[PDB]
Design a binder for this molecule. Structure first.
Ligand SMILES: O=C(CCCCNC(=O)N1CCc2cc(S(=O)(=O)N3CCN(c4cc(Cl)cc(C(F)(F)F)c4)CC3)ccc21)NO
Ligand SMILES: [Mn+2]
Ligand SMILES: [Mn+2]
Length: 243
């Protein structure tokens, strides 16, 4: 089976999510044919030279999955678009493009973070175009780390419902790639949607954010599974009752 996750928004202020992801990497992920992380792995990223210990702890945990024979892939989210090749080398992850077409047991599948489908938020897409301009990224990354951390903290303070996808953008993307299956995150609305693309039924599968429980999509030769699971090993104890 091939696994997909997104929208973990890892951060040191939410250690339960981190513990949940570490348990996922040490368990389920080790049995997978591959693991794809479709963006927003981290709640923030200001560049690979950031010494935040969480980054090294996550890199090491992913690298153990890779070393165990499970290739791991990353598509950037809007929170962590600055993840670069230094982190890719540290974690053993392979960085992919913003859209990729996969062969999953014969099923052709488009994968993407999903924010580019949200074409009714023209303000967001304009800002997105700016922070994805290479010369702007290179200027930001050249700033001292403490300056980047101040900029990012102010921006997060200033930003504190997610616009959903545009149905026509979905059809356009799925016809550009000639697929009947699309997996994405970003909208934080885990679901399976049927539509029509390329003159045939098509499906859009949406990952959940890791808010109170984890979420993954598991693709097998036989089916597509949207799975919700607890972060920690929920230890069984017997609550007494009476009838
Ligand atoms: O995502 C969703 C829901 C939609 C959410 C849409 N809002 C969103 O994404 N936000 C809002 C606040 C925020 C802060 C971060 S950040 O703290 O990591 N960091 C800020 C500084 N960044 C920067 C980079 C560059 Cl190149 C240039 C510049 C500068 F502006 F200075 F020029 C700054 C790098 C990134 C990352 C994402 C965001 N569902 O999935
Ligand atoms: Mn997200
Ligand atoms: Mn997002």
């Amino acid at each position: 089976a091939t696994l997909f996750i997104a929208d973990l928004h890892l951060q040191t202020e939410e250690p339960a999510i981190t513990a949940g992801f570490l348990r996922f990497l040490q368990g389920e992920a080790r049995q997978a044919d591959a693991l794809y992380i479709l963006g927003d792995l981290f709640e923030a990223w200001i560049g690979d030279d950031d010494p935040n210990p969480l980054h090294q702890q996550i890199a090491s945990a992913i690298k153990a999955v890779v070393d165990a024979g499970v290739p791991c892939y990353f598509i950037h989210g809007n929170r962590d678009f600055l993840v670069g090749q230094r982190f890719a080398r540290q974690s053993g992850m392979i960085l992919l493009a913003e859209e990729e077409r996969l062969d999953l047991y014969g099923r052709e599948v488009l994968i993407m973070h999903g924010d580019t489908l949200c074409t009714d938020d023209q303000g967001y897409l304009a800002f997105r175009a700016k922070v994805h301009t290479p010369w702007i990224q290179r200027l930001f990354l050249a700033l001292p780390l403490f300056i980047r951390h101040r900029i990012a903290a102010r921006m997060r303070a200033d930003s504190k419902e997610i616009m959903d996808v545009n149905p026509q953008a979905v059809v356009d993307a799925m016809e550009r790639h000639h697929v009947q299956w699309l997996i994405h995150g970003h909208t934080h609305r885990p679901a399976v949607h049927e539509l029509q693309a390329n003159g045939q039924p098509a499906w859009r599968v949406v990952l959940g954010a890791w808010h109170s429980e984890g979420s993954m999509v598991k693709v097998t030769p036989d089916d597509v599974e949207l799975i919700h699971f607890p972060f920690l090993e929920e230890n069984l104890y017997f609550q007494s009752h009476h009838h």
